[PDB]
Amino acid sequence: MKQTYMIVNELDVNKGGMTTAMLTRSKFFLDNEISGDIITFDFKANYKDILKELVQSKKMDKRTQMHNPFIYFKNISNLQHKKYNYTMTRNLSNLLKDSVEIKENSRISRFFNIMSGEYLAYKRETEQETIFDLFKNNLRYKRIYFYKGKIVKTEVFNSDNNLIAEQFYDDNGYLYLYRQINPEKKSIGKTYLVCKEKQFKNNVEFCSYFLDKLIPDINDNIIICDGPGSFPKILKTNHKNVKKFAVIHVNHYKNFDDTGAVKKQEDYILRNANKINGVVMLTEAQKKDIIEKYKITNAYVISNFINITDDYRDKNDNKVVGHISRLVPQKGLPYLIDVAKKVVEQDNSVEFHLYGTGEEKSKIENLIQESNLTNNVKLLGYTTNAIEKIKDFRCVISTSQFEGQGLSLIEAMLLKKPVVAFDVKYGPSDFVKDGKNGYLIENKDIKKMANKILKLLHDKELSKSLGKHGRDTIIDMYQPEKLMVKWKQLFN
Amino acid sequence: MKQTYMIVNELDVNKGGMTTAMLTRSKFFLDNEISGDIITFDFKANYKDILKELVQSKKMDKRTQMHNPFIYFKNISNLQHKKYNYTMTRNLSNLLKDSVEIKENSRISRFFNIMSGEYLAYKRETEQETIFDLFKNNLRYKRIYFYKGKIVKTEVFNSDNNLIAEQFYDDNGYLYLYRQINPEKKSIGKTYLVCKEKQFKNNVEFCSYFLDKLIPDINDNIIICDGPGSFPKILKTNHKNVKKFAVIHVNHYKNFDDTGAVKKQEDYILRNANKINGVVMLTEAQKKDIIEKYKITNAYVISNFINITDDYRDKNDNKVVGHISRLVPQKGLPYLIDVAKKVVEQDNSVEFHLYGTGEEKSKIENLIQESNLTNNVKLLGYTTNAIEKIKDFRCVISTSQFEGQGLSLIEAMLLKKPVVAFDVKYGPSDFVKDGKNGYLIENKDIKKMANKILKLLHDKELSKSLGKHGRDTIIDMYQPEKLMVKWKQLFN
Amino acid sequence: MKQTYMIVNELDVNKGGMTTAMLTRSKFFLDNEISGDIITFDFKANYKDILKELVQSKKMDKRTQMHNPFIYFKNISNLQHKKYNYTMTRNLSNLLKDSVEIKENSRISRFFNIMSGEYLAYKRETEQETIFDLFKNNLRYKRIYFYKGKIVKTEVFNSDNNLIAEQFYDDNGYLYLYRQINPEKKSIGKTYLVCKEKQFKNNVEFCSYFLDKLIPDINDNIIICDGPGSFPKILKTNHKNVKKFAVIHVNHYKNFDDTGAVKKQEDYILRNANKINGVVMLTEAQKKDIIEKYKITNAYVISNFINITDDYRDKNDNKVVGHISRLVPQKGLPYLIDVAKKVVEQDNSVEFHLYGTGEEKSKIENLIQESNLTNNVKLLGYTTNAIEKIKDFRCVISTSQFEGQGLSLIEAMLLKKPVVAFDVKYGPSDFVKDGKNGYLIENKDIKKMANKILKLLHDKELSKSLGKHGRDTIIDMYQPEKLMVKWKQLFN
Ligand SMILES: [Cl-]
Ligand SMILES: [Cl-]
Ligand SMILES: [Cl-]
Ligand SMILES: [Cl-]
Ligand SMILES: [Cl-]
Ligand SMILES: [Cl-]
Ligand SMILES: [Cl-]
Ligand SMILES: [Cl-]
Ligand SMILES: [Cl-]
């Protein structure tokens, strides 16, 4: 049974894109006797609960395992000793002994000695998460983190209360990892594995060491670096038999850059692509651009797996248009506010409920009132669920100028719902067949977009027909069975 | 018996203006069954001795009491415990045990360990005031203050030897107050009352808490905020029955500001005058300007109390003219040096002994030599006593461009001595009746001032007559009995 | 027996100029019943070994003694106590007890506690020289130096890891010296002698105290300040009978300064020359310039002692020209590279092996390749020995624009070897008699220098004759016996 290892840095809840796609990939892979496991490199004491919530929310398969350096070496150190280190816990209590706890809030509480007249510590008692900011001469020297009534991590700060070193302890109370962080650049430098008496120059060396000790050197094990920041770690691994790949999930080109400069991260994975066993893209256009600029031969194009769920039941209604996209400078609805203003001049009754939070939200809502859209638009409260939310909604908007793959658009095709793409990143040129299915209009085409959106709403049955065969288009193009065959060819 | 509470921040020795006026006010108030007590907010271990010296120097009545937050809460904590905290004292001795005291001076002495090779502490043994600057890694971490062989206050410093926190102990050796000071802005921030397990955001909240716990909420108790910086503390008090007033002792207008901008402090007490029960002024002109710009209705005009002392006995003499005013940029004798130079060209024998120290003193004395007045002027050594000093002197000068009330001028009227005002702040338009009494000449009138001063000296008996009825003018206008009647009307 | 005291700051190995000259001076002085002792002011635990190596390398006489403040007061403190201070040593071991030593290199080793999770110390175990950089909150607080398994010196650093204080211990483990260093200006300030409970404002006061306690106040003892930086220390000595002198070994004029500004150090020794009993120069020209600008009367001219070694035996050969001079901006071979390029255009076979390291070396070697001299020149590897190295070499180059005394040139005269001076500092106008002996050509005379160098090589026997009587010239002018007679006249 082939053991694939999707490489990322973090895997938290309420996070889509690569995260969700990797979970989907794992399930489909395992369905064809190919163990799908995720490799993270972040520290989270709540990781157990996070992954549990995900599995329970059908956001990941139970077979999908998560390998993390911290947990791995924690278990190694847990077996080195037998007794519990009560030293730190006792010392903390003896410091806050006969102290006066001045509670500012219900959680916030500061400790003071009346006998030594010294500020001892600060405590924010969050649910089973007490954080003791220890003080010396009214200056923070340490910050003890707690979980399940056990010290999980301590942090030493400098004269500017900036992190200079982080420390990680096992479930026996002993140190296994010591990382020195540069106050400037905020970069994890000299890393020390005290559980194996080892010294690393960077976290890259530590993460590579972890991967070399976890993944055995056989062609039975594949490595799929989905994250563009974890690539340096898969490039330094001392493996010579394990195949390594790099899945690109986004536009390699920098956001809003007419210059046509490629993102530093993606540039590296494409310049040093002569070292990896393949670079996987989702769009044929992405391939053309990359395989021209970098002139690479390992440019393979296999799209992301997508579940067809079920068939909807003629859910017809209309109260508001919807972008259904997280607020992003270019990958949001910036110019779509102007489109809404134009539609308001025709039908003022038409509202606009676009879900998703972000930084642009502020200016967008301010510009709404400016363009007399205080009531004419009514953005949703980033409702977690979307499938059932807009199952009855049609005429979805897509003013993205830099998309990597139209996931939401391909989902609406299976939801028999029309779309209004701007065909500015060729992420929807594959899905929206213009007249046939959806509306692949040009970029900054507010005029044409307005007419299309209004007509689409008016012609209900007609628009449904366009989307109904659009489902079949998606089903055919992105056929799960066909996709994993391509993966197998690349892997083996 | 009405209990008035004059609110100021500090009350030290060798300090006039509000300080002296408040003491005078208290005496006169008490003479009419109205307890006159002063409220300070500063920390001074020597306060007992300071107030004793004042009472002994007839600079305050024995009935005038002083309420201070530090002392109040010190007594509260002194009753919480029974034994003495010898911990700190013993620890200090054990640190400086078998140490080598290298005495730089008679007072300055540094301690060094030959066994640990560490700089322990620095000690400046002033009379019963040992200050131990404790050192760690040749960097000051603490500064222990001593009084009556008891730790009174400790101070924790940062990497730049700048105060980050101050601590105050009781007479039992326990902490009752902890104040965090921002290294920048040098402002007392988060304040902690460990004697009552309370937390304050600023010293304003702590001082308001003190006033709310001291002054009961009845109309029998009045609050007279004489200090312009203590007003925010009387504005935040949770009293709803206690009447609050604001006495202005100075020109609200900024010093040397043709722009006519009002001092930020005074501006606040006049913009938020709609909250207090009255704003007391000393000059009718001050009222007109304030009651116009701020358009307030609670603008009352009652002048400061002044003692008539006794009647002089024709003390006639002349060796030097005298300004008898502390060196101040505009409230000093800047242009009066040019006046002196002009008089020298007429009578070179005429000397100029003006008492009072300041920053301007340097340039003034340098400009003296420049204007050939090295000997032609001979400033006095800021002799504390003035009443008896210039009792025999006549032709006093007043080149103040921004005075709030001519106290020295009104004193010379009772001393039957002529004056030479510049009528530039209308502080002397009330007293100096031009020809009748003194010489209320215009501003920058060196020419006219010279002629007036010379003539005044020459005509002795005539000048005395002008000042003799000037005493009666002051007596009538500023009649003690009449002033306290006005106060009573405002209070009740 | 007269006791002369040559005053310098440091006396390390592989160092010429004053250092070597002082050793030579001492030997010759002692040969005439005049004790020659060197006074240093630097701390070096290896000083014993350094001076031993020198004596063994015939680089100093066994009679030449070295007096150092550190050693002097160390012996004083060694007699104050009897037992050894094991405190520090034990405390160091107890800190690194049950610690995990993570060895980065063979020497570099860091210590970590798994029970307290704290970075303890850093250790670079050089041959019998363990340096423990003690750490607190991942910040360096101390640096313990070791020698013969004994703490010799500790150093306390600040928040910027910059020295704030240095500490020195005796052979019994007790502190005798504590010096506070300003992080800015890097200057030893307040100095404390804990062995004699004394306090000094600077190291000047401490070094003067040392000299006042070492040298008795009689005319039997002379002080020769050879070092220009130790002069302030001989100017503040409380001696009134001991004669003080100042030997100038270099050009008082600043390097590459057409302005003609005199070096601050030398300027001081010549402006405050009215205080010392004489200023000794090596060049009559130096005297003229100094005795004109400063108009001093104590300007004496006695040249440095030089050993005539033996007579060479017609060592004739030629493979490369040689400057035999440490790389220095103006006192090096900067323009001599252009001279070499010109010679290459005539004889490309001619190589150029100039010995001596420096900063200019980089640019010089780069400019070699630039001027097609990658192979045409071949600088030697700064071979310590020079006497025997180029004993067979002739036509030595001297493109120095600011020399104080042509030592190497005077050595080649005794080695019967021609020279090519630039007569730009008049250091060789005394030695090179142009046609008669060597070649005293003008400055920036690449043209003339080229012709001279080539002709000199061609005419072997002739060039030898010029150098053979040049030895006699040096022997006569710089006659050892004659020089010490001049010294005696000045001393007594
Ligand atoms: Cl135990
Ligand atoms: Cl216990
Ligand atoms: Cl490699
Ligand atoms: Cl006890
Ligand atoms: Cl005791
Ligand atoms: Cl309010
Ligand atoms: Cl012992
Ligand atoms: Cl032992
Ligand atoms: Cl002197």
Numbering used by the authors:
A (entry chain AAA), B (entry chain AAA), C (entry chain AAA): 1 to 492
Give me lines lifted from the publication on this model.
Staphylococcus epidermidis expresses glycerol phosphate wall teichoic acid (WTA), but some health care–associated methicillin-resistant S. epidermidis (HA-MRSE) clones produce a second, ribitol phosphate (RboP) WTA, resembling that of the aggressive pathogen Staphylococcus aureus. Each blade of the homotrimer contains a catalytic domain with a canonical GT-B fold, consisting of an N-terminal acceptor substrate-binding domain (ABD; residues 1 to 68 and 202 to 302) and a C-terminal nucleotide-binding domain (residues 303 to 492). TarM(Se) is a retaining WTA glycosyltransferase; therefore, the relative positions of donor and acceptor substrates in TarM(Se) and TarP are different.
To understand why the closely related TarM(Sa) and TarM(Se) proteins use different donor substrates, we solved the structure of unliganded full-length TarM(Se) from S. epidermidis at 3.2-Å resolution. Like its homolog TarM(Sa), TarM(Se) forms a symmetric, propeller-like homotrimer, with three blades projecting from the central hub that mediates trimerization via its trimerization domain (TD; residues 69 to 201). In line with this property, the elution profile of TarM(Se) from size exclusion chromatography corresponds to a molecular weight of 162 kDa, suggesting that it exists as homotrimer in solution. On the basis of calibration of the column, TarM(Se) wild-type and TarM(Se)G117R mutant proteins have estimated molecular weights of 162 kDa (N = 6) and 55 kDa (N = 8), respectively, in agreement with the calculated molecular weights of 180 kDa for a TarM(Se) homotrimer and 60 kDa for monomeric TarM(Se)G117R. mAu, milli-absorbance units. Since the resolution of the native TarM(Se) structure was limited to 3.2 Å, we generated a G117R mutant [TarM(Se)G117R]. The C1 hydroxyl group of RboP4 in molecule A is 33.7 Å away from molecule B in the homotrimer, which corresponds to a length of 3.7 RboP units. Therefore, it is not possible that three TarM(Se) molecules in the homotrimer glycosylate the same poly(RboP) chain at the same time in the processive reaction.
